[PDB]
Amino acid sequence: NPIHDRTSDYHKYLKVKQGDSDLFKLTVSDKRYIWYNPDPKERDSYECGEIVSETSDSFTFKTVDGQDRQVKKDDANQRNPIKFDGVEDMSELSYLNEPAVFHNLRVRYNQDLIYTYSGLFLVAVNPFKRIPIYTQEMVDIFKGRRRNEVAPHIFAISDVAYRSMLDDRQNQSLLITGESGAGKTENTKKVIQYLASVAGRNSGVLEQQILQANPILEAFGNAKTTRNNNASRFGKFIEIQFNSAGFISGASIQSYLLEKSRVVFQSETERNYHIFYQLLAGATAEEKKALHLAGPESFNYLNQSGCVDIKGVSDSEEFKITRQAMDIVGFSQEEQMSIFKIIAGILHLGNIKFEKGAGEGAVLKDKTALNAASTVFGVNPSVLEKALMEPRILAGRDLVAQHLNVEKSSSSRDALVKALYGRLFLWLVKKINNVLCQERKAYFIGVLDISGFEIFKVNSFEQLCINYTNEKLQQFFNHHMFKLEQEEYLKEKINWTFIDFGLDSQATIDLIDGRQPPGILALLDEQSVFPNATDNTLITKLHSHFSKKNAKYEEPRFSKTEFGVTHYAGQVMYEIQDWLEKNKDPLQQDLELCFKDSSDNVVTKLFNDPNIASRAKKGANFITVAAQYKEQLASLMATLETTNPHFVRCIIPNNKQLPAKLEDKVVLDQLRCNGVLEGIRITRKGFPNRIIQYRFGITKIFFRAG
Ligand SMILES: Nc1ncnc2c1ncn2[C@@H]1O[C@H](COP(=O)(O)OP(=O)(O)NP(=O)(O)O)[C@@H](O)[C@H]1O
Ligand SMILES: Cc1ccc2c(c1)C(=O)[C@]1(O)CCN(c3ccccc3)C1=N2
Ligand SMILES: [Mg+2]
Numbered sequence: 054n055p056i057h058d059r060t061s062d063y064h065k066y067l068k069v070k071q072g073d074s075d076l077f078k079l080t081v082s083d084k085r086y087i088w089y090n091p092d093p094k095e096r097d098s099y100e101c102g103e104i105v106s107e108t109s110d111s112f113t114f115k116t117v118d119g120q121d122r123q124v125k126k127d128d129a130n131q132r133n134p135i136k137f138d139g140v141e142d143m144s145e146l147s148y149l150n151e152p153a154v155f156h157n158l159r160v161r162y163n164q165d166l167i168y169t170y171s172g173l174f175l176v177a178v179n180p181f182k183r184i185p186i187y188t189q190e191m192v193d194i195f196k197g198r199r200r201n202e203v204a205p206h207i208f209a210i211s212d213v214a215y216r217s218m219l220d221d222r223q224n225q226s227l228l229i230t231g232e233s234g235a236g237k238t239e240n241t242k243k244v245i246q247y248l249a250s251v252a253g254r255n256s257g258v259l260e261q262q263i264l265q266a267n268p269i270l271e272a273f274g275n276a277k278t279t280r281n282n283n284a285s286r287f288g289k290f291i292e293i294q295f296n297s298a299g300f301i302s303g304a305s306i307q308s309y310l311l312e313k314s315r316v317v318f319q320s321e322t323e324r325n326y327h328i329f330y331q332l333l334a335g336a337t338a339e340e341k342k343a344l345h346l347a348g349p350e351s352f353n354y355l356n357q358s359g360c361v362d363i364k365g366v367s368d369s370e371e372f373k374i375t376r377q378a379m380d381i382v383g384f385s386q387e388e389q390m391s392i393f394k395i396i397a398g399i400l401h402l403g404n405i406k407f408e409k410g411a412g413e414g415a416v417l418k419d420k421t422a423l424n425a426a427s428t429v430f431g432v433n434p435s436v437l438e439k440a441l442m443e444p445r446i447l448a449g450r451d452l453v454a455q456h457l458n459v460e461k462s463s464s465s466r467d468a469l470v471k472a473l474y475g476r477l478f479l480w481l482v483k484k485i486n487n488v489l490c491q492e493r494k495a496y497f498i499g500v501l502d503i504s505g506f507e508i509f510k511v512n513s514f515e516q517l518c519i520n521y522t523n524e525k526l527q528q529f530f531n532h533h534m535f536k537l538e539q540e541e542y543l544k545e546k547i548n549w550t551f552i553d554f555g556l557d558s559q560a561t562i563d564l565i566d567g568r569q570p571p572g573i574l575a576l577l578d579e580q581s582v583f584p585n586a587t588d589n590t591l592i593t594k595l596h597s598h599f600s601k602k603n604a605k606y607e608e609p610r611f612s613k614t615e616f617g618v619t620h621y622a623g624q625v626m627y628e629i630q631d632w633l634e635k636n637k638d639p640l641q642q643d644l645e646l647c648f649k650d651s652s653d654n655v656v657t658k659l660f661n662d663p664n665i666a667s668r669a670k671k672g673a674n675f676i677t678v679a680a681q682y683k684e685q686l687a688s689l690m691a692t693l694e695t696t697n698p699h700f701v702r703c704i705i706p707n708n709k710q711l712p713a714k715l716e717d718k719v720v721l722d723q724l725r726c727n728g729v730l731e732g733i734r735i736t737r738k739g740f741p742n743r744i745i746q747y748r749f750g751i752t753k754i755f756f757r758a759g
Contacts, residue, residue: 056203058221062718063194066186067204069139079135086132087114088152089122099152101132119425132156141205142170147308154730155721162706164716168205171729172736173534174700175210178720179236182712187243189250196251203363207701211247214498214699217298218585226499226696230526230727231703232622233505234281234710240701241291241502242267245304248293248478248498252301259489260514263293263304265378265632266485270306272331273374273478276315280507282363283709285706286312286326286700287478288503289523290689305490308482309503309522310678314514314635316399319358320509324676326474327371329355330362332396335372344397345425354391354403383488388487391655394429399470401426407442407462414456415442431652438645441466470642473648476659482508483664499696501526501689506622510735514635515546516628518682520620525686527621527727528558530700534732545622545750547740554731558621561605565618566683571598573618574679581636582674592616622726636677702727 055061059071070525072080088099102114105121110543113123121335128148137146138160146153161169161180169176181224186206195208197216203209218355229237233605245267249260249381278284296302319325321582333349340346349355362368379389407415417423417438427434442453442462457465505522507516535554543550566572571579576594580586595616600608607617615626648660660666669676707716724730738756740748748755 055190057434061217062185062188062190063204064563066165067167067191067206069161084719087112087124088130088150088156089114089116090131091116091118096504096533097721099130099155099717104131105718112516137165139164139376144170144172144733146733149730149733149737151721151724154724154733155717156269158720159715162717166205166209167297167667170200171702172733174702174705174732175205175207176702177207177236177240178704178715179234179239179714180708181263181706187246190677192247192250192563195247195570199477207243207249209245210699211498212251214697215248215251215299217697218295218496218498221697222496223499224499224696226501227701228526228529228693228698228700229701229703230523230530231505231521232280232705232723233278233507234704235505235705235723236506237502238271238275238283238285238530238568240703241500242518244500249301251298252293252295254300259303260301262382262488264305264307265381266489266536268371268375268378269382269481269485270308270681272328273326273481274308276312276319276326277360277363278507279320279322279509280368280504280708283553284328284503284507285504286315288694291500292497293500293501294490294492294573295496295498296492297495302492302494303488303490306482307689308478308690310518310682312504313475313480314439314513314515316470316474317354317467319401320511321358322360323358324354324360324363327368328375328396329400330368332393334368334584335370335376335395336554340393346397346399352403353398354400360625381484384484388484388655391653392477392481394431394653395473395659398426398430401429402470403465405441405466407458407459407466410456412456414460414463415459417442432650432656433645436647437732440643441469444643446641449614461684464634465641466646468638469644472640472644473656473659477655479665480659480662482654489508491710491745496554499692501542502692506620508599508623512625512627513630514632514678515640516625517565517618518679520618520625521562522623522686523560523622523697524558524565524620525690528554529690529698530732531556531558531728533700534728534735538735541743542740542748542755545743545748545753545755547748547750547755549740549748549756552735554735554737555730556621556728558729559664559745561601561618564599564603564605573599577632577679578677581633581677586633588614588629588632590630598696623722636679637675638678666681702729 055063055758058064076253087102087104087106089097090096093102100117102116104112104114106113111123111125112129113121117122130152132151133146133148138157140146140157143157156635158169158178165180167180194206195203195206195212197210200209200213213269214227218225227432229240231237245263249263274287275283276286290307292305293301294303312499315325330349333346333716336346349361354360367489401422408418410416423434429435442628443456445452445454503522503526504519508587539551547645564572566574568575573595576598580591580594591613594607599606605619608625609615609617614629618628645660648656651657703721707714707719739759742756743750745753746757
């Protein structure tokens, strides 16, 4: 049994190494220790001091450099006896304080033990290197094991959810939180791997298709940002579906709004979506001539950020892997070829250069890029040129050809690019779901992988929606861990004094999405239909409603175009430029009419299939992106409320994507804003189990521990 064999790989990579006689000596020491700050300006930098004396209310301890200091017992962060260092479940610690919890994660992380329980939920600290704990042999070890029978692991919480699903006949979710780069997408994939394996299984083709969906989604929906070389730029909820017997019967991917803006613009050092680099690196021979391709430096949409490759990644090899996944999932050769024509066409569109005509209207003097795009998309270049520079609109009921200047023509060309790419992405997910989901499900385990909290030098509308999604997820953790839990204790009247755990994201949520008094998204929508609005009237309206009024909002003194939201994970300043256009998300109807006539069978579907190309109305206006965002988030939250949730908190070790480098302030900020210590305390002080060290409740008896 590998669990008990100290030579096994399980022991070697998932268990705390045996300590030596010198460590034994230290472990039976009668000395006692304290975690203190050498510099009180930096509360997160701790050293260990020996406690050398005490009074009824203070400790005196030695500092690393010697000099003795005193501290009130009520302010003291005592160090755990060292037999606790490496403990698998931190609810076992005697002293529950910040430096002690960090220390335990630190000891485990120093020996590549990245998973640790923190009471009821799992903490996963990103190793930023490969650790061989996800093999089939590891999978087989965890299969069917109760949590306290095996070491902490993403496989274990996955098995727990799978047995709860069987035993309780109840849908489950696995909610994996974390800032950008923390490990959500990798851990998501391990949960899927594990479930596909243990739920069977000779009848392996579906399981393979499920796994192969990922390189396709990542190639199109992930990109290098400053926070993650493989940042997810869309959120997803993956439903792994099981028949009533408990075997996997299918899967279905719910994808959320994609950051289409990245197709046309990337900040310094970032990349566009991986697929563009994969194509240009990995085509073939006649693909490059058939698609009129050259290198990334030759395309405006890839030559701006100064970064065309990612250390340790071969875009040409990844292209082979993406195509191989497209084959396995079932995309035809003609379908793959049309997918790449659309990628190539986008890049050609981005190389159109509009310039000033005799008058204010733009003209196109060099049509090389226009012609190449039109060739690959299968559209008429003269019709496309006219739809870009001279689109027709109604003015009242009259039909009037506009003549757009350079800036507007360029923006319209970008709008067409973003629509093509976002619609292609939706089409990819739809095609995948049609393959993966071929049976009605009895049960599901849903795994949520959102885009993680992020802060850049410039934060725009996309960042506010990403960070709001993260705030809402933290609140769902707070609701589950603290608020519902104490609501039960009351509904049962069990002698329980309510405890304020001081974690409540409600104020920030009402600021962003309040109705009600109206929050930020509601005012954005109101401005979006006001004929006379500008990004400046919008910011003025926000300040008017919130400045010196809402405690989570800040009107900054250093800028007239930004506002601050105090999120659970820190304040973010948001630049208002282009918000009304991003929210309206316009696309000239003459461009749509041009692409509806495409000779290409995939392009034609992107523009004629209503599930892909149609947009809902609200009154006399198309539904705004903020409204679409809210519908998606509301649908997710409604789904989660039907499941029994399991939480995995991914923690990034530093801001440099490096292994073996824990950064104290970075880690501790996450431990605080994630509510990890509060989560351990409720576990310890509360009454985790109730049917039908104790309380007799009105209709159940509640159990502690044990
Ligand atoms: N358990 C792991 N083993 C090995 N490498 C990992 C692990 N978890 C994370 N990584 C590395 O860390 C990188 C970022 O992790 P990822 O799971 O993509 O982050 P994320 O939380 O999904 N970020 P985002 O999509 O931007 O919100 C990965 O590409 C891997 O290099
Ligand atoms: C549950 C949910 C709902 C909406 C979402 C997300 C998740 C995301 O993670 C994103 O898919 C990440 C990008 N993003 C987005 C992009 C542009 C505009 C608004 C949101 C997101 N919206
Ligand atoms: Mg991700």
